[PDB]
Subunit: 425 residues, 4 copies
């Protein structure tokens, strides 16, 4: 229908130049796709209540950030427990259950050279409490990441390390830091004090571009909706900042004082959700997919090869979703790096992977709880149907939609190799 092609900035998406794309942007073209940029909310006194955390999960919070610069281990353990209680209160309905990752943000090495002794103790606390992600403060070189990795020990091998770039050295040694990190955070607060304030946007845009090229998650952080700490509505500069972080290519956007200590934590999450949805429809996919495709090197890894085939197939038919089965989240991450317009519905049995895939733009995790079927192909089919039924319930899919289904040839991680075109019945 013509109405379908007027929504989600589709006239602007068909443009032959970026300039014509901008000219075709329409404030009356409503977003239809699910919001794909994850929201990280910092936990604090304004957002620790189990009832308030349920409201924040409903508003769109995907990752709960524990800022280890404030509070003791006992404070952070109560934070984790309240987060988990609010998250599990929705587990009774598996088709709508929303996993929420827990991220530990370290205090950092102040005047110190390597990992501080408080960071070693906090990192071990994170492993003991099962945190999914570490936002490592003031990462200046590859050896800082290795030290964080070593402090996590053998039991924390699965924890994702997102390096926070907060100073000139981190920006200059960015390539070597990205190579050993799982992702990056553009920590604009310290960065804006360490380098001239008028240069932070160059560092943000460069880091987001390089992370998009590398296919690794990038978070835009600090003062995105600052005035909402005290005011019910943000400034014109703040909504523009959130929209531009999404247009830049950020996988995640963050709220600090806005959720940790402010008077409007739920509204700040709702505002980021509303802006991100509008900005995602305004992305010029024609140029973006072409440039990601051109820049990505050749690969002999079947997961990487299946991912680009599936993203190309999704664009060809305007697929509502790409449903992928994943154990570690890697197959969903490889789909996400090509920035499909189609939602990537990731079905997994790993509760940790379901939480961690929120780092990748456009990945919607579904935690599958059923015990395995005796026939492996039936187990695969049951999981795919769970993705379809959840997708229908949540509004991602309707009967008649085309979906791309990504699976593997045998059980266990690392064997994704199949792409299949499916009609929703």
């Amino acid at each position: 229908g013509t109405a379908f092609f007027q929504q989600q900035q589709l006239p602007a998406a068909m443009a032959d130049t970026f300039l014509e794309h901008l000219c075709l942007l329409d404030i009356d073209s409503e977003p239809v796709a699910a919001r794909s940029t994850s929201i990280i909310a910092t936990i604090g006194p304004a957002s620790r209540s189990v009832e308030r955390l349920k409201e924040m999960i409903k508003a769109g919070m995907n990752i709960a950030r524990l800022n280890f610069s404030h509070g003791s281990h006992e404070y952070h353990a109560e934070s984790i427990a309240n987060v988990r209680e609010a998250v599990e209160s929705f587990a009774g309905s598996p088709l709508s259950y929303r996993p929420v990752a827990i991220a530990l943000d370290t205090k950092g090495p102040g005047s110190g050279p390597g990992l501080s002794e408080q960071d070693v103790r906090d990192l071990r606390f994170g492993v003991e409490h099962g945190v999914d992600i570490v936002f490592a403060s003031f990462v200046r070189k590859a050896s800082d990441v290795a030290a964080v990795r070593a402090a996590l020990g053998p039991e924390g091998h699965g924890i994702k390390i997102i390096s926070k770039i907060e100073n000139h050295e981190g920006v200059k040694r960015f390539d070597e830091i990205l190579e050993v990190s799982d992702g990056i955070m553009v920590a604009r607060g310290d960065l804006g004090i360490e380098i001239p304030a008028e240069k932070v946007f160059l560092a943000q845009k460069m880091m987001i571009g390089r992370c998009n090229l590398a296919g690794k998650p990038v978070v835009c952080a600090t003062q995105m909706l600052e005035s909402m700490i005290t005011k019910p509505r943000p400034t014109r500069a703040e909504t523009s900042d959130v929209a531009n972080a999404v247009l830049d290519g950020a996988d995640c956007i963050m709220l600090s004082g806005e959720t940790a200590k402010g008077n409007f934590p739920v509204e700040a999450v709702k505002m980021q959700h509303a802006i991100a949805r509008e900005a995602e429809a305004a992305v010029y996919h024609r140029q973006l997919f072409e440039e990601l495709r051109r820049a990505a090197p050749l690969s002999r890894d079947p997961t990487e090869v299946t991912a680009i085939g599936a993203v190309e197939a999704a664009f060809k038919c305007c697929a509502a979703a790409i449903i992928v089965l994943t154990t570690t989240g890697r197959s969903a991450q490889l789909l996400s790096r090509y920035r499909p317009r189609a939602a990537v519905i990731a079905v997994t049995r790993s509760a940790q992977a379901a939480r961690q895939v929120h780092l990748c733009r456009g990945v919607f995790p579904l935690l599958y709880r059923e015990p395995p079927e005796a026939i492996w192909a039936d187990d695969v089919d049951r999981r795919v149907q769970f993705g379809i039924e959840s997708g229908k319930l949540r509004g991602f899919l309707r009967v008649g939609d085309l979906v791309i289904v990504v699976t593997g040839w045998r059980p266990g991680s690392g064997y994704t190799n199949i792409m299949r075109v499916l009609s929703i019945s």
Copy 2:
């Protein structure tokens, strides 16, 4: 892994270029072609190429389609030539490395206003003798194609109709002719008499471009190696013409008097084979695939969606081949329209589809004759492995190579929807 020597062959430095101009500048006479020749050679069978022994030499030299010109000879003469072609083709049923299907094409005498009486009788002869293709002379409008289609009786609806555009009217009404035809032949002999000789190249390039856009086969014909009727080597203009027909986007190249009456029929086939191989490596796939992709409309047909995903996957890993299971040839034709560098190995049970897919550039048919397995998934696997083993035997594949496999979810034509990435073991 593949080595620097691999990336110096088949014009790979010219293929990585960012502009067409830089691509031309990087063309290297020392960069040897490695891929199998993908543009089919149509040879006109006449007194110089009629004998079974001469036909075996022409099959070995590269002839894919035998053309019988019903403007000359008689029904009895052409039936004997057809029987000699089939005898020479079946003499290789012993060695899988030498057995290659050869299509039989009937070229009509032509039109008075509508279809001629002789054409009706010749078309009936073609149906009775099981011809695969009809090259319909002097097609001027859509109703001419409908008349040929009606003349293909109750038993010849599977025969492909390739409309020969030979005059101003055919050029002007090209779009309506292409819409109802299976393909087109740029019949340059009559076209060069009907319109100014200096305009034929415009008509050739336009028709090849529109056929490439439509995903329908296009043949370049007449005087390609004319001087080889009497001389053992062609002129500089002739080799250039063959190379440029391939670079233009032609699916097939043809030999007329060169093979029908000339002194060097086998040498003319060998020359077309040598030039086509060199020209195919010189194709600028980066721009071609992007333009075919951009111009092709969105599709909700799973075969079309799977085909673009498979071609994208093949380029990503430098796949040696795309193995496709097809009954009518349609799934192989849809892969061919995106012009993959990978060979499209089409595994089929249909002897007719195996001969007809020679019309599509880059399609290597394999006729499968094993009895169907009781379990459909095992029958599919047996055919996929047949494509791999024939590929290994013929030099398309080696252990460790990556192949793309295109299949459907259920038996019968019209259900292709799966693309798998396979490692050759």
Copy 3:
């Protein structure tokens, strides 16, 4: 590397590390972002004009001299506040601060005066707007920022209220509501330019949609070759704090990257504790953002979207901008009476500064609306031979350019002139080497 090798050996590797030149040579926008370098210092003069709203914090002649030195190009007088007497005194103080630098014509900086109307409030032009518009004509304002423009007839009403004596005043239509956005094309057609008035726009339409309206309007104005201003809350927190937030610097940079010709300061300069520091911050961000513009795609897209033209000024402008990019020209010196020849150069977004030499004091103030235009007011009486008068004006631009650091010995400059006196005859482009 071959397309820059000889120029790299000549100008040096240090030259090609500055002003985001490695990012500018990128083949894709993605690679351009990846090559952005915080250590690549801006060299070019700041080309996006700063509009500062004048109020109690920025009214004194001494404070205005500091704001002119910090980079203020246009002084805005908001007729929603104050009075005729109050605004006349602010205007006189702006003119006194501006003329304190007139002693040296080779370095003098013109400042435009813009009147922002109160608006229609609760259908047509209000009676207060008619009186304020008349005040503007009587006080010789250069620009009118017309509030709440909703249709083409609103701009015709403002034009009529300016009368025959205000024919030269530029009308910049403020788009502040849904109707203005929907009828944008008809409004732009009859306006001299547009202002994305985000304060009211953010109340009239959902706050999360303002960025779509801003980006669309800036893109359409860039396509039309007409000035566009980004306004409201750009550095809001600087009303009370000496440093802005991370979102505020980002907003200023993104307005410039979007294609805005001007950026504005409202409460930041009208009532804030740091008016000069707010101007300095906008200046610092705009210079960094201008160097980060991906000119390769921008110039190609402006060129591809612009229709063919038989107007020699339009034809000369694209030839001059192409020539400037080819040699990395330090400047394009253009002679203009109305500012139009400089505006046509500005629409192709050259990296080279457009030094506009004019005898019209009003055109010198008004060209601040066009990105990258640096006005030079020529005060000498005309030479007897017209060709010598033209040559003197070109040399005035070169000497001012050398004195201000815009030009250096060895630089190439593009000079744009016409074949006969009077407006509308620009048709010549010359390549000159600076000695």
Copy 4:
């Protein structure tokens, strides 16, 4: 109607594929033929009357093959060419200059041969404009030809013929010291596999276009026309593809030297080249030439790109340029404008040599001088406009781009002007 002619619908296409799809056999070429025709002069094309017919048919450069004939024979051919050329000098607004090119025998079994030294000396003595140097294998071969031309042959253009594997492999070093290149397909097709010649041709044409130096496509382009009145389908395609590849010149050898249809072969090349030039996809070509061309601080180079950009912006009928050596016209030609480059020169040699550059139409200025240099320039510019009007390039109401310098003498081009005709 203007936008239906000269493949303008195909020129507005957003992709090369859509450009091909929009090519129309009914879209007639309007622009003057840009690719020069080189005709080999021999027994079939030696008479003054036959040469007048060949000049009228479109011959721009007369080639004398020093592998055949003798010094006396070639001197008589040269005198006949000059007599046929000067028979049109009575009307200076329509006079067509014709270059004279000497094609050397080559080194054969051996540096520069002794016959080549004598033939090169003959060329200097007879005032030839160009040398097509046979079997150039390396940069030192070009230096040897340059030395054999001596001080009196400082201004003869050396076009290196690439005829073997070594010439192809050492192409970059040869192009660097040569004025241009000839893709000599006859020997090249014997020296390397015949099926690889198209790769060498396309590579060399691309590199010469990149370098802004003339490239000639040669041998067997219309071979069958040696005995038949019409060419084959492969032959017309070859001529069209050489033009679409980016060749500045196309050549006729036996077709004009010994063939039964020399005038018809020239007419056929003219007809094909005109059709192929309109079919060029300028949108991609100009963009790629622009992107690949390096940044420059030379004002002639800077003015040239500004003038070509301005010409495309207004659909200028022509770019009128004043040149002494032909260099300013060559720098305009390298950007492949659709607008004709009308080069007004006082140098008879530069007028002949500038036929090597695609789209350059030389006008030999023989009008009285103006006392004021500024008046003399304006007169040479109005001369371009009167010749352009007479020859069909320009009409009243057309826009032209005029390229001049700031001071007399070569090397000072720095001005571009937009002018309305009459």
